[PDB]
Amino acid sequence: KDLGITEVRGAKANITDLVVYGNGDTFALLCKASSQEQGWMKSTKVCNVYGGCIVQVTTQQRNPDGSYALAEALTFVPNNHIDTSGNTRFIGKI
Amino acid sequence: NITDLVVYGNGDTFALLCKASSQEQGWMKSTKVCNVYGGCIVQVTTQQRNPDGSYALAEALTFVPNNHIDTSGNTRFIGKI
Amino acid sequence: EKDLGITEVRGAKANITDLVVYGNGDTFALLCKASSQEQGWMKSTKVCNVYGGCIVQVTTQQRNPDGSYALAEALTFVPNNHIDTSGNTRFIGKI
Amino acid sequence: KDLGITEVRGAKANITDLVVYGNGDTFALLCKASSQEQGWMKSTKVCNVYGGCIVQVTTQQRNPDGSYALAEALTFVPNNHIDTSGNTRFIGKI
Amino acid sequence: NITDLVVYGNGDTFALLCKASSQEQGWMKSTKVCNVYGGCIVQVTTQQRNPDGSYALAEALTFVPNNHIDTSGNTRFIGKI
Amino acid sequence: EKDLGITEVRGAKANITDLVVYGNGDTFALLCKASSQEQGWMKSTKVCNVYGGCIVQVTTQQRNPDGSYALAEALTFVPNNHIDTSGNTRFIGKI
Ligand SMILES: Nc1ncnc2c1ncn2[C@@H]1O[C@@H]2COP(=O)(O)OP(=O)(O)OC[C@H]3O[C@@H](O[C@H]2[C@H]1O)[C@H](O)[C@@H]3O
Ligand SMILES: Nc1ncnc2c1ncn2[C@@H]1O[C@@H]2COP(=O)(O)OP(=O)(O)OC[C@H]3O[C@@H](O[C@H]2[C@H]1O)[C@H](O)[C@@H]3O
Ligand SMILES: Nc1ncnc2c1ncn2[C@@H]1O[C@@H]2COP(=O)(O)OP(=O)(O)OC[C@H]3O[C@@H](O[C@H]2[C@H]1O)[C@H](O)[C@@H]3O
Numbered sequence: 001k002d003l004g005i006t007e008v009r010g011a012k013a014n015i016t017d018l019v020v021y022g023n024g025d026t027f028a029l030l031c032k033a034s035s036q037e038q039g040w041m042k043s044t045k046v047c048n049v050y051g052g053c054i055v056q057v058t059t060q061q062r063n064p065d066g067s068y069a070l071a072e073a074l075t076f077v078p079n080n081h082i083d084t085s086g087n088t089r090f091i092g093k094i
Numbered sequence: 095n096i097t098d099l100v101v102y103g104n105g106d107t108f109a110l111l112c113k114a115s116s117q118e119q120g121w122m123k124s125t126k127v128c129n130v131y132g133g134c135i136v137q138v139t140t141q142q143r144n145p146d147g148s149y150a151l152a153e154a155l156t157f158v159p160n161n162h163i164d165t166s167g168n169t170r171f172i173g174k175i
Numbered sequence: 176e177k178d179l180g181i182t183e184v185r186g187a188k189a190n191i192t193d194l195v196v197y198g199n200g201d202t203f204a205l206l207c208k209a210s211s212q213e214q215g216w217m218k219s220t221k222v223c224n225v226y227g228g229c230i231v232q233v234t235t236q237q238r239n240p241d242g243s244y245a246l247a248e249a250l251t252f253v254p255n256n257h258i259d260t261s262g263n264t265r266f267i268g269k270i
Numbered sequence: 271k272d273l274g275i276t277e278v279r280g281a282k283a284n285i286t287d288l289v290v291y292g293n294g295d296t297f298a299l300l301c302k303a304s305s306q307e308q309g310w311m312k313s314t315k316v317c318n319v320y321g322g323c324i325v326q327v328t329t330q331q332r333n334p335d336g337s338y339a340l341a342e343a344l345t346f347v348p349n350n351h352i353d354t355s356g357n358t359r360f361i362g363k364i
Numbered sequence: 365n366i367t368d369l370v371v372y373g374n375g376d377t378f379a380l381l382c383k384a385s386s387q388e389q390g391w392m393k394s395t396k397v398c399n400v401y402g403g404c405i406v407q408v409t410t411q412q413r414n415p416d417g418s419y420a421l422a423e424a425l426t427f428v429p430n431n432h433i434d435t436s437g438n439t440r441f442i443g444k445i
Numbered sequence: 446e447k448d449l450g451i452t453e454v455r456g457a458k459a460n461i462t463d464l465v466v467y468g469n470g471d472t473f474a475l476l477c478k479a480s481s482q483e484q485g486w487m488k489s490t491k492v493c494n495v496y497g498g499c500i501v502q503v504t505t506q507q508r509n510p511d512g513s514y515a516l517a518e519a520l521t522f523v524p525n526n527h528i529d530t531s532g533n534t535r536f537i538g539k540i
């Protein structure tokens with residue numbers, strides 16, 4: 001598992017057998033932290049919709065034996081969108 | 095692909111919005127959407143295979159008012175009903 | 176092993192000899208399900224109709240090669256919809 | 271793990287070292303299915319609050335090696351309460 | 365009981381509502397509540413210890429409008445603000 | 446092993462030599478945290494302020510005796526509240 005992917009173009013450039021259906025950036029990356037050595041990645045991604053957005057938080061932790069623990073959570077946020085017009089993205093009023 | 099697959103009801107009740115996967119790295123991630131009256135139900139799914147062949151799994155779900163997955167083109171999107 | 180293909184209580188009672196049910200075990204009614212007993216997974220959506228809307232549950236279970244399981248659950252309230260079980264195919268729609 | 275507990279009185283009568291803080295029936299059992307042999311239990315519990323209720327779904331699956339997999343989920347339901355005045359409980363209008 | 369415990373902020377931001385546990389059977393289940401303006405945040409927690417000493421964990425969270433955990437008596441409850 | 450006591454990005458960068466951060470890594474600001482590095486667990490609440498409310502995340506991680514981990518996450522929207530970080534103790538309150 002590559003712990004530092006930030007967009008679908010960087011994913012296709014680093015995973016040789018990646019298969020993507022639909023718009024791979026439907027959930028745009030808001031922020032992410034990872035340590036390849038400590039084996040973890042945490043990210044927030046946002047899908048803009050009519051009148052609000054869908055916010056996803058993701059955690060993945062690699063174990064010493066090579067296995068993984070995973071968690072995901074999701075919520076709807078009214079009248080906000082992720083702004084992707086800057087280098088540092090944020091959620092704000094539509 | 096699955097010889098003994100059994101489906102109850104509409105197996106596409108949650109229609110696929112997007113998906114990424116890698117068979118070698120052993121993970122898949124998808125978003126699926128069920129259109130209902132006045133809004134839609136959005137499901138996110140992650141599955142990761144481990145080196146010993148076992149799996150880690152996660153799921154999350156939310157309601158989105160006044161949106162439907164629009165399947166009228168090749169690229170689906172969630173938008174105003 | 177876990178039966179991954181149950182669709183209602185009557186079927187569970189007929190296939191699980193020691194099943195114990197408290198209350199109405201069809202409170203969360205099956206909307207859709209897919210499963211493979213040999214590949215070892217099931218995914219289902221269930222709906223509990225309530226006053227003014229319904230509660231929707233999505234459920235995933237995956238069997239591992241060593242016979243253990245991975246599991247996930249998620250839940251949301253849906254206003255002004257109910258599962259309709261009056262026809263061959265069930266659906267969520269306006270109350 | 272006892273897979274068939276239905277109320278806090280039955281839990282105290284079967285678990286010798288059980289410790290309960292607060293009202294142990296804050297989340298009242300709505301429905302439950304379990305198989306001791308297949309090793310699983312699934313339950314819905316409901317906490318009545320002002321103007322609505324909190325609904326919890328719980329799944330626990332025992333593995334061949336004696337370990338467990340667990341999952342939980344929670345949502346708020348407006349203008350409904352669990353009715354406990356009958357033997358078979360239901361969620362309905364407050 | 366925990367010698368190296370480190371707490372940041374108010375360690376009781378989520379106040380305990382109820383809890384059940386068994387040290388021998390190896391599980392604990394709790395509900396905790398954070399009072400906010402106009403409502404409260406309700407967290408449910410489960411932890412199960414395995415025979416090999418490892419753990420399974422689960423968490424869930426929801427917002428409840430116009431309720432607070434009432435801590436004015438020995439038995440706490442969620443009720444109208 | 447996982448550092449279970451991080452409270453902000455500056456502390457993570459100073460204690461995790463290969464940390465990589467995309468975007469503003471304090472987007473979810475720490476509200477409260479408890480951890481024991483020796484017992485192997487951490488529990489935290491983080492808040493992302495947005496227009497008209499905030500997003501609240503609760504996070505749990507537990508280390509197992511074999512060095513592996515169990516994890517859980519949950520998330521909800523809270524209307525008309527923000528985390529206030531202007532004082533010694535942070536709190537969620539009216540915007
Ligand atoms: N809820 C999802 N539903 C469907 N598909 C998803 C979801 N979530 C992730 N994906 C796909 O996996 C790829 C890499 O994911 P990843 O390497 O495992 O880490 P990440 O933090 O989740 O994604 C960070 C960025 O990557 C880009 O492509 C992603 C997505 O195409 C995206 O623009 C992300 O914003
Ligand atoms: N949130 C729940 N709360 C309480 N109890 C639950 C829940 N969810 C499931 N149960 C009980 O387990 C039995 C078998 O479940 P299962 O075999 O593991 O598969 P499934 O997809 O979850 O349920 C498919 C159908 O089975 C029937 O009986 C179920 C339920 O009585 C039902 O009519 C289901 O609609
Ligand atoms: N909440 C559910 N409730 C009931 N059943 C479900 C759910 N979720 C998935 N299923 C069933 O599993 C099949 C394959 O699942 P899969 O191979 O494991 O990956 P996926 O990302 O979840 O689904 C990608 C697409 O597959 C199609 O059939 C699905 C569904 O019939 C669907 O149209 C999906 O849109």
Ligand SMILES: Nc1ncnc2c1ncn2[C@@H]1O[C@@H]2COP(=O)(O)OP(=O)(O)OC[C@H]3O[C@@H](O[C@H]2[C@H]1O)[C@H](O)[C@@H]3O
Nearest residue numbers: 275276277278294295297298299313384393394395408
């Ligand atoms: N979100 C919770 N928060 C705090 N505490 C909880 C929660 N959930 C469960 N508990 C406690 O465990 C005991 C047994 O739990 P159990 O044996 O593991 O199975 P169950 O289906 O979850 O609970 C079925 C019934 O048991 C009674 O006592 C429960 C509770 O005091 C209750 O009235 C339940 O309605």
Ligand SMILES: Nc1ncnc2c1ncn2[C@@H]1O[C@@H]2COP(=O)(O)OP(=O)(O)OC[C@H]3O[C@@H](O[C@H]2[C@H]1O)[C@H](O)[C@@H]3O
Nearest residue numbers: 033042043044057451452453454470471473474475489
């Ligand atoms: N939902 C998230 N989405 C994206 N990224 C996240 C999330 N959640 C955490 N991160 C990143 O991991 C780093 C270390 O996290 P961690 O060490 O594993 O502990 P923690 O309790 O989750 O975060 C405590 C503080 O750490 C700082 O940096 C964090 C974050 O940049 C932050 O200011 C936290 O407020």
Ligand SMILES: Nc1ncnc2c1ncn2[C@@H]1O[C@@H]2COP(=O)(O)OP(=O)(O)OC[C@H]3O[C@@H](O[C@H]2[C@H]1O)[C@H](O)[C@@H]3O
Nearest residue numbers: 375376378379380394396409477478479488489490503
């Ligand atoms: N979402 C959280 N965010 C930050 N920190 C958290 C959260 N949740 C828990 N904590 C911290 O762990 C300590 C012990 O946790 P614990 O021993 O593992 O069990 P518990 O049921 O979760 O908490 C029972 C009571 O303990 C007190 O201190 C807690 C908290 O400081 C609290 O007042 C609890 O009300």
